[model samples]
Target chain A: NDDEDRAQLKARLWIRVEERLQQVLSSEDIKYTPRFINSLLELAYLQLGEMGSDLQAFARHAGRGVVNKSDLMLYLRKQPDLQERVTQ
Target chain B: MLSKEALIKILSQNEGGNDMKIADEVVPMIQKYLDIFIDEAVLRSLQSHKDILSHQDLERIVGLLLMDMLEHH
Candidate 1:
Protein backbone atom coordinates (compact mmCIF):
# COMPACT_ATOMS: atom_id res chain seq x y z
CA ASN A 1 0.00 0.00 0.00
CA ASP A 2 3.03 2.27 0.02
CA ASP A 3 2.57 2.83 -3.69
CA GLU A 4 -0.97 3.97 -3.08
CA ASP A 5 0.24 6.20 -0.29
CA ARG A 6 2.86 7.72 -2.52
CA ALA A 7 0.32 8.34 -5.26
CA GLN A 8 -1.94 10.21 -2.88
CA LEU A 9 1.00 12.13 -1.50
CA LYS A 10 1.99 13.17 -5.01
CA ALA A 11 -1.52 14.34 -5.71
CA ARG A 12 -1.55 16.52 -2.63
CA LEU A 13 1.90 17.79 -3.40
CA TRP A 14 0.73 18.82 -6.87
CA ILE A 15 -2.10 20.85 -5.41
CA ARG A 16 0.17 22.63 -2.98
CA VAL A 17 2.71 23.46 -5.67
CA GLU A 18 0.02 24.68 -8.04
CA GLU A 19 -1.44 26.94 -5.40
CA ARG A 20 1.88 28.63 -4.78
CA LEU A 21 2.51 29.11 -8.47
CA GLN A 22 -0.88 30.63 -8.95
CA GLN A 23 -0.44 32.93 -6.00
CA VAL A 24 2.90 34.17 -7.29
CA LEU A 25 1.71 34.73 -10.84
CA SER A 26 -1.50 36.39 -9.79
CA SER A 27 0.41 39.21 -8.14
CA GLU A 28 2.26 40.06 -11.34
CA ASP A 29 -0.76 39.44 -13.59
CA ILE A 30 1.41 37.12 -15.66
CA LYS A 31 -0.32 35.07 -18.32
CA TYR A 32 0.53 31.41 -18.51
CA THR A 33 -1.39 28.58 -20.03
CA PRO A 34 -2.67 25.90 -17.68
CA ARG A 35 -0.72 23.32 -19.60
CA PHE A 36 2.43 25.31 -19.04
CA ILE A 37 1.86 25.49 -15.33
CA ASN A 38 1.10 21.79 -15.17
CA SER A 39 4.18 20.94 -17.20
CA LEU A 40 6.42 23.02 -14.96
CA LEU A 41 5.05 21.40 -11.83
CA GLU A 42 5.50 17.93 -13.26
CA LEU A 43 9.04 18.76 -14.26
CA ALA A 44 9.77 20.18 -10.80
CA TYR A 45 8.42 17.07 -9.12
CA LEU A 46 10.65 14.80 -11.15
CA GLN A 47 13.70 17.01 -10.74
CA LEU A 48 13.15 17.27 -7.01
CA GLY A 49 13.27 13.50 -6.83
CA GLU A 50 16.45 13.48 -8.88
CA MET A 51 17.89 16.11 -6.53
CA GLY A 52 17.01 14.02 -3.52
CA SER A 53 18.76 11.01 -5.02
CA ASP A 54 21.83 13.05 -5.78
CA LEU A 55 21.82 14.55 -2.32
CA GLN A 56 21.72 11.06 -0.88
CA ALA A 57 24.79 10.01 -2.81
CA PHE A 58 26.59 13.19 -1.94
CA ALA A 59 26.03 12.58 1.75
CA ARG A 60 27.06 8.95 1.48
CA HIS A 61 30.14 10.03 -0.40
CA ALA A 62 31.14 12.01 2.65
CA GLY A 63 30.23 9.12 4.96
CA ARG A 64 27.31 10.97 6.46
CA GLY A 65 23.81 9.77 7.22
CA VAL A 66 22.02 13.09 7.02
CA VAL A 67 22.01 15.22 3.87
CA ASN A 68 22.96 18.73 4.87
CA LYS A 69 23.60 22.05 3.17
CA SER A 70 26.97 20.89 1.86
CA ASP A 71 25.39 18.00 -0.01
CA LEU A 72 22.83 20.37 -1.53
CA MET A 73 25.55 22.82 -2.47
CA LEU A 74 27.33 20.06 -4.36
CA TYR A 75 24.13 19.20 -6.17
CA LEU A 76 23.71 22.82 -7.21
CA ARG A 77 27.33 23.46 -8.11
CA LYS A 78 26.53 23.29 -11.81
CA GLN A 79 23.46 25.49 -11.42
CA PRO A 80 25.02 28.87 -10.91
CA ASP A 81 21.89 30.95 -10.71
CA LEU A 82 20.04 28.65 -8.36
CA GLN A 83 23.14 28.15 -6.27
CA GLU A 84 23.61 31.89 -5.85
CA ARG A 85 19.96 32.61 -5.25
CA VAL A 86 19.53 29.81 -2.72
CA THR A 87 22.71 30.83 -1.00
CA GLN A 88 21.36 34.29 -0.18
CA MET B 1 2.32 26.70 0.27
CA LEU B 2 4.51 23.63 -0.06
CA SER B 3 4.63 22.30 3.49
CA LYS B 4 7.70 20.86 5.14
CA GLU B 5 5.74 17.70 5.86
CA ALA B 6 5.05 17.28 2.16
CA LEU B 7 8.70 17.73 1.26
CA ILE B 8 9.75 15.23 3.87
CA LYS B 9 7.20 12.78 2.53
CA ILE B 10 8.43 12.95 -1.06
CA LEU B 11 12.12 13.03 -0.27
CA SER B 12 11.78 10.13 2.13
CA GLN B 13 9.81 8.07 -0.35
CA ASN B 14 12.88 6.35 -1.71
CA GLU B 15 12.32 2.73 -2.66
CA GLY B 16 15.35 1.12 -1.08
CA GLY B 17 16.72 1.03 2.39
CA ASN B 18 19.19 3.67 3.50
CA ASP B 19 16.69 6.31 2.49
CA MET B 20 18.08 9.79 2.92
CA LYS B 21 17.17 12.28 5.59
CA ILE B 22 17.27 15.97 4.74
CA ALA B 23 18.24 18.83 7.02
CA ASP B 24 15.52 21.12 8.37
CA GLU B 25 17.14 24.11 6.69
CA VAL B 26 17.17 22.39 3.33
CA VAL B 27 13.42 22.79 2.90
CA PRO B 28 13.49 26.52 2.22
CA MET B 29 16.35 26.15 -0.23
CA ILE B 30 14.29 23.84 -2.44
CA GLN B 31 11.27 26.12 -2.11
CA LYS B 32 13.35 29.00 -3.38
CA TYR B 33 14.43 26.72 -6.20
CA LEU B 34 10.82 26.29 -7.30
CA ASP B 35 10.32 30.06 -7.16
CA ILE B 36 13.40 30.75 -9.26
CA PHE B 37 12.36 28.13 -11.79
CA ILE B 38 9.11 29.99 -12.44
CA ASP B 39 10.97 33.26 -12.69
CA GLU B 40 13.28 31.84 -15.34
CA ALA B 41 10.37 30.60 -17.44
CA VAL B 42 8.61 33.94 -17.23
CA LEU B 43 11.76 35.90 -18.02
CA ARG B 44 12.48 33.76 -21.07
CA SER B 45 8.97 34.23 -22.32
CA LEU B 46 9.19 38.01 -21.89
CA GLN B 47 12.50 38.19 -23.70
CA SER B 48 10.92 36.48 -26.71
CA HIS B 49 8.29 39.28 -26.94
CA LYS B 50 5.53 36.86 -26.16
CA ASP B 51 2.40 37.89 -24.29
CA ILE B 52 1.56 34.50 -22.96
CA LEU B 53 3.92 31.91 -21.53
CA SER B 54 3.51 28.52 -23.18
CA HIS B 55 4.57 25.03 -22.29
CA GLN B 56 7.10 25.18 -25.10
CA ASP B 57 8.79 28.10 -23.41
CA LEU B 58 9.05 26.08 -20.24
CA GLU B 59 10.39 23.16 -22.24
CA ARG B 60 12.94 25.44 -23.88
CA ILE B 61 14.35 26.54 -20.52
CA VAL B 62 14.42 22.95 -19.30
CA GLY B 63 16.30 21.95 -22.44
CA LEU B 64 18.89 24.62 -21.90
CA LEU B 65 19.33 23.98 -18.21
CA LEU B 66 19.43 20.20 -18.18
CA MET B 67 19.77 18.92 -21.69
CA ASP B 68 22.82 16.94 -20.70
CA MET B 69 21.15 15.74 -17.54
CA LEU B 70 18.25 14.33 -19.52
CA GLU B 71 20.08 13.24 -22.63
CA HIS B 72 23.12 11.62 -21.08
CA HIS B 73 21.58 9.98 -18.07
Candidate 2:
Protein backbone atom coordinates (compact mmCIF):
# COMPACT_ATOMS: atom_id res chain seq x y z
CA ASN A 1 0.00 0.00 0.00
CA ASP A 2 2.85 2.40 0.85
CA ASP A 3 4.62 1.50 -2.38
CA GLU A 4 1.43 2.17 -4.28
CA ASP A 5 1.07 5.53 -2.55
CA ARG A 6 4.66 6.42 -3.45
CA ALA A 7 4.06 5.50 -7.08
CA GLN A 8 0.91 7.61 -7.13
CA LEU A 9 2.78 10.55 -5.65
CA LYS A 10 5.53 10.21 -8.25
CA ALA A 11 2.98 10.18 -11.03
CA ARG A 12 1.40 13.32 -9.63
CA LEU A 13 4.84 14.95 -9.48
CA TRP A 14 5.58 14.10 -13.09
CA ILE A 15 2.26 15.55 -14.15
CA ARG A 16 3.08 18.74 -12.32
CA VAL A 17 6.52 18.86 -13.97
CA GLU A 18 4.95 18.47 -17.40
CA GLU A 19 2.47 21.22 -16.65
CA ARG A 20 5.22 23.56 -15.51
CA LEU A 21 7.33 22.75 -18.56
CA GLN A 22 4.41 23.50 -20.80
CA GLN A 23 3.86 26.80 -19.09
CA VAL A 24 7.55 27.70 -19.51
CA LEU A 25 7.66 26.68 -23.15
CA SER A 26 4.55 28.66 -24.01
CA SER A 27 6.13 31.88 -22.87
CA GLU A 28 6.90 34.39 -25.64
CA ASP A 29 10.23 35.69 -24.37
CA ILE A 30 11.88 32.64 -22.79
CA LYS A 31 13.55 31.38 -25.92
CA TYR A 32 15.43 28.11 -25.60
CA THR A 33 17.51 26.15 -28.06
CA PRO A 34 17.33 22.36 -27.93
CA ARG A 35 20.37 22.40 -25.70
CA PHE A 36 18.77 24.90 -23.35
CA ILE A 37 15.58 22.85 -23.19
CA ASN A 38 17.62 19.80 -22.28
CA SER A 39 19.38 21.85 -19.64
CA LEU A 40 16.04 22.98 -18.23
CA LEU A 41 14.80 19.43 -18.00
CA GLU A 42 18.01 18.46 -16.23
CA LEU A 43 17.57 21.35 -13.82
CA ALA A 44 14.10 20.07 -12.98
CA TYR A 45 15.58 16.70 -12.14
CA LEU A 46 18.17 18.40 -9.98
CA GLN A 47 15.34 20.06 -8.11
CA LEU A 48 13.78 16.65 -7.56
CA GLY A 49 17.11 15.32 -6.32
CA GLU A 50 17.29 18.15 -3.80
CA MET A 51 13.75 17.39 -2.69
CA GLY A 52 14.70 13.73 -2.31
CA SER A 53 17.62 14.68 -0.07
CA ASP A 54 15.43 16.93 2.03
CA LEU A 55 12.90 14.16 2.47
CA GLN A 56 15.65 11.75 3.48
CA ALA A 57 17.05 14.13 6.09
CA PHE A 58 13.59 14.83 7.38
CA ALA A 59 12.82 11.14 7.70
CA ARG A 60 16.11 10.51 9.49
CA HIS A 61 15.52 13.25 12.08
CA ALA A 62 11.75 13.02 12.40
CA GLY A 63 11.40 9.24 12.58
CA ARG A 64 9.46 7.19 9.99
CA GLY A 65 7.77 9.39 7.39
CA VAL A 66 5.53 8.86 4.40
CA VAL A 67 8.12 9.37 1.65
CA ASN A 68 10.48 6.42 1.15
CA LYS A 69 13.96 7.96 0.75
CA SER A 70 15.63 4.85 -0.65
CA ASP A 71 12.93 4.51 -3.26
CA LEU A 72 13.35 8.10 -4.33
CA MET A 73 17.12 7.70 -4.43
CA LEU A 74 16.81 4.61 -6.60
CA TYR A 75 14.43 6.36 -8.92
CA LEU A 76 16.75 9.34 -9.22
CA ARG A 77 19.81 7.13 -9.72
CA LYS A 78 18.14 5.57 -12.72
CA GLN A 79 18.24 9.02 -14.28
CA PRO A 80 21.97 9.02 -14.95
CA ASP A 81 22.00 11.98 -17.35
CA LEU A 82 20.03 14.04 -14.87
CA GLN A 83 22.46 13.08 -12.13
CA GLU A 84 25.43 14.12 -14.26
CA ARG A 85 23.78 17.41 -15.16
CA VAL A 86 23.10 18.13 -11.51
CA THR A 87 26.64 17.22 -10.50
CA GLN A 88 28.05 19.49 -13.20
CA MET B 1 15.53 56.12 -6.09
CA LEU B 2 16.90 59.60 -6.23
CA SER B 3 16.29 62.03 -9.08
CA LYS B 4 18.57 61.75 -12.11
CA GLU B 5 20.18 65.11 -11.22
CA ALA B 6 20.99 63.91 -7.71
CA LEU B 7 22.39 60.65 -9.06
CA ILE B 8 24.55 62.51 -11.54
CA LYS B 9 25.83 64.76 -8.76
CA ILE B 10 26.74 61.77 -6.61
CA LEU B 11 28.48 60.03 -9.49
CA SER B 12 30.39 63.17 -10.38
CA GLN B 13 31.61 63.56 -6.81
CA ASN B 14 32.57 59.90 -6.61
CA GLU B 15 34.72 60.22 -9.75
CA GLY B 16 36.90 62.86 -8.01
CA GLY B 17 37.78 65.08 -11.00
CA ASN B 18 36.05 63.66 -14.08
CA ASP B 19 33.16 66.02 -13.46
CA MET B 20 33.34 66.96 -17.16
CA LYS B 21 30.27 65.55 -18.99
CA ILE B 22 29.54 63.25 -16.05
CA ALA B 23 25.78 63.35 -16.58
CA ASP B 24 26.11 62.78 -20.29
CA GLU B 25 28.45 59.83 -19.81
CA VAL B 26 26.80 58.10 -16.82
CA VAL B 27 23.07 58.65 -17.29
CA PRO B 28 22.95 56.60 -20.50
CA MET B 29 24.77 53.70 -18.87
CA ILE B 30 22.47 53.76 -15.86
CA GLN B 31 19.39 54.03 -18.04
CA LYS B 32 20.59 51.27 -20.34
CA TYR B 33 21.14 48.81 -17.49
CA LEU B 34 17.83 49.78 -15.92
CA ASP B 35 15.97 49.05 -19.15
CA ILE B 36 17.66 45.68 -19.60
CA PHE B 37 16.91 44.81 -15.98
CA ILE B 38 13.24 45.66 -16.54
CA ASP B 39 13.11 43.41 -19.58
CA GLU B 40 14.68 40.56 -17.63
CA ALA B 41 12.29 41.09 -14.73
CA VAL B 42 9.32 40.83 -17.07
CA LEU B 43 10.68 37.59 -18.54
CA ARG B 44 11.36 36.15 -15.09
CA SER B 45 7.88 37.02 -13.85
CA LEU B 46 6.43 35.15 -16.80
CA GLN B 47 8.72 32.21 -15.99
CA SER B 48 7.70 31.96 -12.30
CA HIS B 49 3.99 32.54 -12.91
CA LYS B 50 4.11 35.57 -10.67
CA ASP B 51 3.31 39.25 -11.05
CA ILE B 52 5.90 40.52 -8.61
CA LEU B 53 9.43 41.36 -9.78
CA SER B 54 12.43 39.28 -8.69
CA HIS B 55 15.80 40.66 -7.59
CA GLN B 56 17.66 37.57 -8.74
CA ASP B 57 16.35 38.11 -12.27
CA LEU B 58 17.33 41.74 -12.09
CA GLU B 59 20.92 40.84 -11.15
CA ARG B 60 21.31 38.43 -14.03
CA ILE B 61 19.82 40.91 -16.49
CA VAL B 62 22.06 43.67 -15.18
CA GLY B 63 25.11 41.47 -15.69
CA LEU B 64 24.04 40.88 -19.30
CA LEU B 65 23.31 44.56 -19.84
CA LEU B 66 26.70 45.53 -18.40
CA MET B 67 28.49 43.06 -20.62
CA ASP B 68 26.84 44.49 -23.70
CA MET B 69 27.45 48.02 -22.55
CA LEU B 70 31.13 47.35 -21.92
CA GLU B 71 31.50 45.63 -25.22
CA HIS B 72 30.02 48.52 -27.18
CA HIS B 73 31.66 51.27 -25.16
Candidate 3:
Protein backbone atom coordinates (compact mmCIF):
# COMPACT_ATOMS: atom_id res chain seq x y z
CA ASN A 1 0.00 0.00 0.00
CA ASP A 2 1.04 3.65 -0.39
CA ASP A 3 1.12 4.08 3.38
CA GLU A 4 3.83 1.44 3.73
CA ASP A 5 5.86 2.95 0.90
CA ARG A 6 5.62 6.41 2.39
CA ALA A 7 6.68 5.12 5.81
CA GLN A 8 9.77 3.51 4.33
CA LEU A 9 10.67 6.70 2.48
CA LYS A 10 10.34 8.74 5.65
CA ALA A 11 12.65 6.35 7.50
CA ARG A 12 15.31 6.78 4.84
CA LEU A 13 15.01 10.51 4.88
CA TRP A 14 15.53 10.66 8.64
CA ILE A 15 18.75 8.69 8.35
CA ARG A 16 19.87 11.05 5.62
CA VAL A 17 19.39 13.99 7.95
CA GLU A 18 21.75 12.57 10.57
CA GLU A 19 24.26 11.68 7.88
CA ARG A 20 24.19 15.21 6.49
CA LEU A 21 24.72 16.77 9.91
CA GLN A 22 27.74 14.58 10.55
CA GLN A 23 29.11 15.27 7.09
CA VAL A 24 28.95 18.97 7.67
CA LEU A 25 30.74 18.62 11.00
CA SER A 26 33.49 16.57 9.37
CA SER A 27 34.00 18.90 6.42
CA GLU A 28 37.29 20.83 6.28
CA ASP A 29 35.60 24.09 5.36
CA ILE A 30 33.22 23.93 8.30
CA LYS A 31 34.38 26.03 11.27
CA TYR A 32 32.00 25.63 14.15
CA THR A 33 31.47 28.73 16.24
CA PRO A 34 29.44 28.34 19.43
CA ARG A 35 26.99 31.05 18.51
CA PHE A 36 26.63 29.77 14.96
CA ILE A 37 26.00 26.21 16.12
CA ASN A 38 23.46 27.36 18.66
CA SER A 39 21.71 29.45 16.07
CA LEU A 40 21.58 26.56 13.61
CA LEU A 41 19.95 24.25 16.13
CA GLU A 42 17.61 26.96 17.30
CA LEU A 43 16.53 27.66 13.75
CA ALA A 44 15.78 23.98 13.21
CA TYR A 45 13.66 23.98 16.34
CA LEU A 46 11.78 27.07 15.12
CA GLN A 47 11.10 25.49 11.74
CA LEU A 48 9.71 22.38 13.39
CA GLY A 49 7.41 24.53 15.50
CA GLU A 50 6.29 26.43 12.42
CA MET A 51 5.60 23.17 10.62
CA GLY A 52 3.46 21.96 13.52
CA SER A 53 1.43 25.15 13.28
CA ASP A 54 1.02 24.62 9.56
CA LEU A 55 -0.17 21.05 10.09
CA GLN A 56 -2.67 22.17 12.70
CA ALA A 57 -3.97 24.94 10.45
CA PHE A 58 -4.29 22.49 7.57
CA ALA A 59 -6.39 20.15 9.65
CA ARG A 60 -8.56 23.05 10.77
CA HIS A 61 -9.30 24.12 7.18
CA ALA A 62 -9.75 20.56 5.92
CA GLY A 63 -13.41 20.80 4.94
CA ARG A 64 -12.71 23.89 2.81
CA GLY A 65 -10.45 21.81 0.50
CA VAL A 66 -7.48 24.10 1.19
CA VAL A 67 -5.19 21.55 2.82
CA ASN A 68 -2.95 19.37 0.67
CA LYS A 69 -1.94 16.12 2.40
CA SER A 70 0.78 15.28 -0.11
CA ASP A 71 2.58 18.57 0.50
CA LEU A 72 2.38 18.07 4.24
CA MET A 73 3.84 14.59 3.98
CA LEU A 74 6.71 15.98 1.91
CA TYR A 75 7.37 18.58 4.59
CA LEU A 76 7.46 15.98 7.40
CA ARG A 77 10.16 14.07 5.53
CA LYS A 78 12.26 17.21 5.26
CA GLN A 79 12.49 17.62 9.03
CA PRO A 80 15.58 16.05 10.64
CA ASP A 81 13.80 14.77 13.74
CA LEU A 82 10.87 13.16 11.93
CA GLN A 83 11.94 9.55 12.48
CA GLU A 84 12.40 9.95 16.25
CA ARG A 85 8.94 11.46 16.51
CA VAL A 86 7.45 8.74 14.33
CA THR A 87 9.03 5.80 16.16
CA GLN A 88 8.04 7.15 19.56
CA MET B 1 15.95 47.20 26.14
CA LEU B 2 16.14 50.10 23.66
CA SER B 3 14.09 53.23 24.16
CA LYS B 4 12.45 54.88 21.16
CA GLU B 5 14.58 58.03 21.42
CA ALA B 6 17.81 56.06 21.88
CA LEU B 7 16.95 53.87 18.88
CA ILE B 8 16.18 56.91 16.77
CA LYS B 9 19.41 58.60 17.77
CA ILE B 10 21.49 55.49 16.93
CA LEU B 11 19.81 55.18 13.53
CA SER B 12 20.29 58.85 12.82
CA GLN B 13 23.98 58.64 13.76
CA ASN B 14 24.58 55.56 11.61
CA GLU B 15 22.03 55.90 8.81
CA GLY B 16 21.98 59.76 8.64
CA GLY B 17 18.92 61.99 8.09
CA ASN B 18 15.85 61.84 10.30
CA ASP B 19 13.55 62.57 7.35
CA MET B 20 11.97 59.60 5.57
CA LYS B 21 9.58 60.03 2.64
CA ILE B 22 6.92 57.55 3.75
CA ALA B 23 5.54 56.17 7.03
CA ASP B 24 6.32 52.63 5.96
CA GLU B 25 9.94 53.55 5.15
CA VAL B 26 10.47 55.13 8.56
CA VAL B 27 9.14 52.13 10.46
CA PRO B 28 11.35 49.61 8.62
CA MET B 29 14.52 51.70 9.00
CA ILE B 30 13.95 52.04 12.72
CA GLN B 31 13.16 48.33 13.05
CA LYS B 32 16.35 47.34 11.21
CA TYR B 33 18.57 49.41 13.52
CA LEU B 34 16.83 48.00 16.58
CA ASP B 35 17.59 44.48 15.34
CA ILE B 36 21.31 45.21 15.11
CA PHE B 37 21.25 46.53 18.66
CA ILE B 38 19.46 43.44 19.97
CA ASP B 39 21.90 41.06 18.32
CA GLU B 40 24.88 42.85 19.81
CA ALA B 41 23.24 42.93 23.24
CA VAL B 42 22.51 39.19 23.12
CA LEU B 43 26.10 38.37 22.16
CA ARG B 44 27.46 40.44 25.01
CA SER B 45 25.12 38.85 27.55
CA LEU B 46 26.04 35.35 26.45
CA GLN B 47 29.76 36.07 26.58
CA SER B 48 29.58 37.32 30.17
CA HIS B 49 28.79 33.83 31.44
CA LYS B 50 31.52 31.18 31.71
CA ASP B 51 29.59 27.94 32.17
CA ILE B 52 27.70 25.93 29.59
CA LEU B 53 24.52 27.64 28.35
CA SER B 54 21.43 26.92 30.40
CA HIS B 55 17.92 26.42 29.03
CA GLN B 56 17.03 29.87 30.31
CA ASP B 57 19.77 31.50 28.28
CA LEU B 58 18.80 29.57 25.16
CA GLU B 59 15.17 30.50 25.60
CA ARG B 60 16.01 34.15 26.09
CA ILE B 61 18.24 34.26 23.01
CA VAL B 62 15.67 32.56 20.77
CA GLY B 63 12.89 34.74 22.10
CA LEU B 64 14.87 37.88 21.30
CA LEU B 65 15.86 36.60 17.85
CA LEU B 66 12.33 35.65 16.86
CA MET B 67 10.94 38.89 18.21
CA ASP B 68 13.40 40.88 16.13
CA MET B 69 12.68 38.84 13.00
CA LEU B 70 8.89 38.93 13.32
CA GLU B 71 8.70 42.57 14.35
CA HIS B 72 10.63 43.68 11.30
CA HIS B 73 8.53 41.59 8.94
Best by lDDT: 1
Per-prediction DockQ, in order? 0.43, 0.01, 0.02
Question: lDDT of each prediction vs. the true structure?
Answer: 0.67, 0.37, 0.38
Docking class of 1: acceptable
For DockQ, the strongest prediction is: 1
Tens digit per residue, CA lDDT, model 3, A22-57: 553353343334554444444433443454345445
Per-residue lDDT for A1-88 in model 2, tens only? 5467434444443444344545544645454344433333333333334433443444445454333434333333544432332232
Backbone clashes, each candidate:
0, 0, 0
Superposition error at B64 for model 2 (Å)? 15
lDDT of 3 at B70: 27
Ranking by DockQ: 1, 3, 2
Off by over 4 Å in 1: A27-30, B12-15, B45-52, B67-73
**Inter-residue clash pairs, candidate 2:** none
Which candidate wins on TM-score?
1
Better of 1 and 3 by lDDT: 1
Candidate 2 matches the true fold with a TM-score of 0.31
Q: List the residue pairs that clash in candidate 3.
A: none
